[PDB]
Amino acid sequence: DDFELLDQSELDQIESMKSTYKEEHPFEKRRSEGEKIRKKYPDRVPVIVEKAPKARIGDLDKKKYLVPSDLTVGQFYFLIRKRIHLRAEDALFFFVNNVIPPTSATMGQLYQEHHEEDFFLYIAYSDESVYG
């Protein structure tokens, strides 16, 4: 009948993606490490990469990556996929705040828009194209 007005704010209402890393490392320790690493490497951003709970592909043992601010999401996909156990026929998707980012985005763009108050950017991955 009538139009439905979609609002960007809806994206922000979803609950945060799971992060064992956040839960098991006290906030102040994370924030101190993130601030220090940002000062040390002004051309890089610190990223935490974790499996979405519903993902059906292999887990990732190493979570902490320091990435060039100009690396693109497509390049990051290549590098991270190399480290996960999945079939060539398995898919791989990344999520930042529950949303799949563009292949063309840079890690510095994602970091500026989405880093948390500990100065880390959190990315989840799944073989499914929805976070859960």
Side-chain angles (χ1 to χ4, degrees), residues 2-12 14-28 30-38 40-61 63-132:
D2 217 324
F3 286 93
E4 179 169 337
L5 270 67
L6 297 179
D7 296 328
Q8 280 121 334
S9 61
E10 185 173 339
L11 299 161
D12 292 325
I14 306 292
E15 49 175 348
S16 305
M17 305 185 301
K18 169 176 168 283
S19 171
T20 300
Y21 189 85
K22 280 149 85 170
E23 291 180 288
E24 301 187 354
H25 300 81
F27 176 86
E28 279 179 277
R30 307 193 321 259
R31 180 179 173 95
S32 182
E33 177 168 33
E35 194 172 0
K36 287 173 180 55
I37 207 65
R38 286 290 293 124
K40 186 172 177 177
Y41 295 97
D43 57 356
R44 295 176 177 265
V45 297
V47 183
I48 302 295
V49 180
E50 288 169 296
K51 195 186 68 73
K54 283 184 66 69
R56 298 98 59 77
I57 48 170
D59 211 337
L60 187 61
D61 188 34
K63 301 183 175 193
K64 300 169 71 173
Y65 299 86
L66 197 57
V67 188
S69 61
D70 62 329
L71 189 76
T72 68
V73 166
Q75 296 174 315
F76 189 64
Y77 170 98
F78 179 88
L79 296 174
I80 293 292
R81 182 174 182 124
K82 194 156 84 167
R83 291 142 165 87
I84 302 168
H85 184 78
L86 73 185
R87 296 172 302 172
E89 50 262 62
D90 283 312
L92 183 62
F93 301 94
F94 290 144
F95 305 91
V96 178
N97 288 314
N98 298 279
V99 180
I100 300 173
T103 304
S104 60
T106 64
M107 298 304 304
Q109 292 162 358
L110 295 182
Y111 181 89
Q112 180 278 312
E113 174 158 13
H114 302 291
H115 76 84
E116 298 201 345
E117 295 149 42
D118 59 6
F119 298 102
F120 279 86
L121 171 66
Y122 291 81
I123 300 185
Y125 75 83
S126 186
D127 61 318
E128 299 171 329
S129 61
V130 63
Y131 176 92

